[PDB]
Scaffold this active site. Structure first.
Site, PDB file in Angstrom:
ATOM      1  N   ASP A  45      41.651  38.859  47.215  1.00  0.00           N
ATOM      2  CA  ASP A  45      41.949  40.224  47.478  1.00  0.00           C
ATOM      3  C   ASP A  45      43.008  40.356  48.644  1.00  0.00           C
ATOM      4  OD1 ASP A  45      40.769  42.756  49.574  1.00  0.00           O
ATOM      5  OD2 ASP A  45      40.599  42.902  47.501  1.00  0.00           O
ATOM      6  N   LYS A  79      46.734  46.739  47.289  1.00  0.00           N
ATOM      7  CA  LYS A  79      46.090  47.998  47.224  1.00  0.00           C
ATOM      8  C   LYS A  79      47.221  48.806  47.837  1.00  0.00           C
ATOM      9  CE  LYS A  79      41.599  46.195  49.321  1.00  0.00           C
ATOM     10  NZ  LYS A  79      41.989  44.869  49.660  1.00  0.00           N
TER      11      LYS A  79
END
Ligand SMILES: NC(=O)c1ccc[n+]([C@@H]2O[C@H](COP(=O)([O-])OP(=O)(O)OC[C@H]3O[C@@H](n4cnc5c(N)ncnc54)[C@H](OP(=O)(O)O)[C@@H]3O)[C@@H](O)[C@H]2O)c1
Ligand SMILES: NC(=O)c1ccc[n+]([C@@H]2O[C@H](COP(=O)([O-])OP(=O)(O)OC[C@H]3O[C@@H](n4cnc5c(N)ncnc54)[C@H](OP(=O)(O)O)[C@@H]3O)[C@@H](O)[C@H]2O)c1
Ligand SMILES: C[C@]12CC[C@H]3[C@@H](CCC4=CC(=O)CC[C@@]43C)[C@@H]1CC[C@H]2O
Ligand SMILES: C[C@]12CC[C@H]3[C@@H](CCC4=CC(=O)CC[C@@]43C)[C@@H]1CC[C@H]2O
Lengths: 318, 318
Positions: A45, A79
């Site tokens: 992530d 993101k």
């Protein structure tokens, strides 16, 4: 050990987070990613704002080169930050991340916060008083941009992070919706178990991805240094003894048994390896109830510098 | 693809059943077990009453001998029949099965039915009127013998089959209980979803293992030949089309998404291979609700020849 997203793609249930405390040199991300891969992690992530993507990318490409892993076996998430939420800026940001990573695509792309900030190179634009400069952007327009990124093949799946019930509903009820968010990445641990948000997400086939599972890395400028340290919770210590595991393993297992995809970060090689042992044991139904009892609405990352923003997500009950 | 039992052991969530219809030569079990192994099955379900254990054992040992699989990767289940529930006869039956299998241990051993029958070679002893001759044997006394079998290392885990809520409680509340049953193997499909029994089992850390997932093999003498054919259910056909799968795959996935361990049998190689594809897709939350709506208390195997037995398990609501 994967779960199936609502768009058909598979995501590993345990992922290694690549955000690093300010005190750490960014290059640290490369060594940690290698260590994680060797320990068996396949899910990583990241985010544009972390500024560790290029280093994470080098680690992965390095492990792909020497034949340790294949790109197809790796699940990488990025993101888009608040400064690029404008419909015309979303794809540009993703392309920039792909350039840094030297990747052809990312497996998952999320809206980091449902709060736009003044566009610009600076991730945290402030006025002369030091207050963040907010911007107004139609979140539904931003989602349409995310959908186009998926249709471009730049990202296999799309989702959101730090969205509340109403904000998720706004996207789900959007006229002309093409792709539902596959997940909502939010803070979740025994002190803030997100029971209601979790049940809602499940009812909509939205996977809840949790960060702060071990109490967060307590980042300066974001987490109150006086807040209690999650892993120091007596109940977790007692249960760790009962199962002959560790407080961290107990917290990690708790989330996995609730149908949550767990993220985790450690700067220590031994702990990175230890965390993989979460697949080795089962917590009893009654002990799961005991852990449910620790809920106390303790939010380590309330994104306080964003207070005042019209879209600040943490005011609603959930 | 396994779940953790309450005694720490792992069990594969999809298992191949080795019971064969009366019309099949018992030796058929050998070829089917080999085919299942080649398709990727590791969990095999059998029972002394099936009379296929030696054939199944031969298939497994053949695949172990040629290096296709290791005994440690195989999860084999057997069950003690009604005629051997007496505490003094349980172990002898397991040892007899181990002899047939030429195995040192079985991974799971179950009480086949909570109804003891007259001891003897005949599996279905009947009187001059053709009625089964019941026997009185305390279920907890039988359980103690099962625990001893686990302590002797003849079986790694112990559980039950066809037990209702109250019978499980009887064992759970037994004075001096040493090991809780790891599972309750019962009939379960969209026409008999076992919602209440499933929830009860989960609350006690008991895994519900399902048979009849695809409507049962409709064994003569046990199942009403005019009962509806599960896979002919229109709802399953419609859903199969929507997901680009098959009615069978929809029925299998439904149970897996409910935390149930699924058994399945096919006499056809092509279908045995097909069933492994259940791990490839996800049924939406909404479609799971539609399937829950098919519940109609349709019990294919009511063990009708046992009606009258004090412990007949299917009279209670659950
Ligand atoms: N979307 C968002 O808004 C958002 C926000 C924050 C974080 N994240 C993501 O979540 C990831 C995880 O970061 P986090 O801040 O939430 O932290 P975390 O995973 O909750 O971990 C918190 C702390 O756990 C400790 N720890 C880890 N394994 C341990 C073990 N086996 N025994 C004892 N202590 C252990 C670590 O300390 P040591 O390093 O000393 O071992 C670390 O400081 C990030 O890297 C990022 O990818 C996302
Ligand atoms: N503990 C107990 O009381 C108990 C009782 C009964 C059974 N069991 C266990 O459960 C196992 C499963 O047996 P079951 O009777 O319950 O049957 P089942 O698994 O419900 O299967 C029923 C039927 O499904 C068909 N089928 C399988 N895969 C298919 C596919 N991909 N497409 C279309 N049809 C398909 C098979 O027909 P074809 O062969 O024609 O393909 C079979 O007759 C047994 O072998 C045994 O191990 C336990
Ligand atoms: C708290 C959070 C992760 C840690 C970062 C923060 C943005 C500023 C930062 C800059 C750094 O050089 C180190 C990490 C961090 C402190 C992020 C905002 C959203 C969340 O992911
Ligand atoms: C229906 C069930 C599986 C099928 C068998 C049955 C006992 C008699 C039988 C004898 C046979 O030669 C073939 C299988 C079967 C018809 C079993 C009783 C409990 C259940 O496992």
């Amino acid at each position: 050990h994967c779960v199936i997203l609502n768009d058909g793609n598979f995501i590993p249930v345990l992922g290694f987070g690549t955000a690093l405390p300010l005190e750490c040199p960014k290059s640290k991300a490369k060594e940690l990613t290698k260590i994680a891969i060797d320990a068996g992690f396949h899910h990583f992530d990241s985010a544009s704002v972390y500024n560790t993507e290029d280093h994470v990318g080098e680690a992965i490409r390095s492990k792909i080169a020497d034949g340790t892993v294949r790109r197809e076996d790796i699940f990488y998430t990025s993101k888009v930050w608040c400064t690029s939420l404008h419909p015309e800026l979303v794809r540009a940001s993703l392309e920039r991340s792909l350039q840094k990573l030297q990747f052809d695509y990312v497996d998952l792309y999320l809206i980091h916060y449902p709060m736009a900030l003044k566009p610009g190179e600076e991730n945290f634009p402030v006025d002369e008083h030091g207050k963040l400069i907010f911007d107004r952007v139609d979140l539904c327009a931003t989602w349409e941009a995310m959908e186009k990124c998926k249709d471009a093949g730049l990202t296999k799946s799309i989702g959101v992070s730090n969205f509340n019930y109403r904000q998720l509903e706004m996207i789900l009820n959007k006229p002309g919706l093409k792709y539902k968010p596959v997940c909502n990445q939010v803070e979740c641990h025994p002190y803030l178990n997100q029971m209601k948000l979790l049940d809602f997400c499940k009812s909509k086939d939205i996977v809840l991805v949790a960060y702060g599972v071990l109490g967060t890395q307590r980042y300066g400028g974001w987490v109150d240094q006086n807040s209690p340290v999650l892993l120091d919770e007596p109940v977790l210590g007692s249960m760790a003894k009962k199962y002959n595991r560790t407080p961290a393993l107990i917290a990690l297992r708790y989330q996995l048994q609730r149908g949550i995809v767990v993220l985790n970060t450690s700067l220590k090689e031994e702990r990175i390896k230890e965390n993989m042992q979460v697949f080795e044991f089962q917590l009893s139904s009654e002990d799961m109830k005991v852990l449910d009892g620790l809920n106390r609405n303790m939010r380590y990352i309330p994104a306080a510098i964003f207070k005042g923003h019209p879209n600040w997500p943490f005011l609603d009950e959930y």
